[PDB]
Design a protein around this ligand. Structure first.
Ligand SMILES: NC(=O)c1ccc[n+]([C@@H]2O[C@H](COP(=O)([O-])OP(=O)(O)OC[C@H]3O[C@@H](n4cnc5c(N)ncnc54)[C@H](OP(=O)(O)O)[C@@H]3O)[C@@H](O)[C@H]2O)c1
Ligand SMILES: N#Cc1ccc(CC(=O)O)c(NC(=O)c2ccc(Cc3c[nH]c4nc(N)[nH]c(=O)c34)cc2)c1
Length: 181
């Protein structure tokens, strides 16, 4: 019945998320946490879904692609269909969300973005939480997280320390839409 769409993203001090079609940094521990958050379900035997844009799909190393143990949905008007049964190509956000809510074995939808995919998520009735990694500094991004009104959310108050790997510092944040908390 209740179906959550959570967003997950890492943004720099300017709100940047991408540079030259890829990520402006590489943070293996942060990536491991990403994989755990998007894969783990409470009901064993249920699966999570990730919804992403074409350029996110093209930015995943083909070894890690499709993202294991998750149902992959790629938004694209130009991409040909994917033979793999863990990947479906959807032509609109509405059709992707309808397809996902039709599937009973899907527990949570993880919106892993592309700016426009994040933007559509922020207007979705299923919007629940934002898991935002805030990375310190300006990585000269050319793609940014959407403009968002944080006044719509409650920022969780659990203790959050600084992290550092590869000389790059970051901190985790969690937001819950006010109409749920
Ligand atoms: N740091 C992070 O957490 C993070 C997260 C996500 C992405 N990134 C980075 O950001 C860049 C990718 O993001 P981006 O915003 O440039 O692109 P994106 O959203 O990943 O991909 C854009 C493409 O997705 C398709 N698309 C988007 N919305 C659609 C819709 N409503 N209906 C149908 N198709 C739709 C279209 O594909 P067609 O052109 O094929 O129609 C569009 O050209 C890369 O640099 C990536 O590494 C970083
Ligand atoms: N170590 C490690 C490790 C282990 C397994 C996997 C695949 C998997 O999760 O199963 C990965 N990642 C990827 O193969 C991968 C690469 C790029 C992205 C873009 C992205 C979207 N939204 C995000 N939000 C956060 N915060 N960061 C991010 O990188 C992204 C997303 C996933 C890394």
């Amino acid at each position: 019945r209740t179906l959550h769409m959570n967003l997950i993203v890492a943004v720099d001090g300017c709100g940047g998320i991408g540079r030259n079609g890829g990520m402006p940094w590489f943070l293996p521990a942060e990536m491991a946490r990403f994989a755990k958050l998007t894969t783990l379900t409470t009901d064993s035997g249920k699966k999570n879904a990730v919804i992403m844009g074409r350029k996110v799909w093209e930015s995943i190393p083909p070894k890690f692609r499709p993202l294991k143990s998750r149902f992959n949905v790629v938004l694209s008007k130009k991409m040909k269909e994917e033979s793999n049964e863990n990947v479906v190509v959807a032509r609109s956000f509405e059709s992707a969300v309808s397809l996902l809510q039709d599937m009973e074995n899907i527990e949570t939808i993880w919106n892993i973005g592309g700016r426009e995919v994040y933007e559509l998520g922020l207007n979705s009735p299923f919007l629940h939480q934002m898991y935002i990694t805030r990375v310190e500094g300006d990585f000269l991004a050319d793609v940014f997280f959407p403009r968002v009104d944080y006044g719509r959310f409650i920022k969780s108050t659990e203790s959050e320390e600084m992290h550092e790997e590869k000389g790059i510092k970051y901190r985790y944040e969690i937001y819950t839409i006010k109409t749920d908390k």
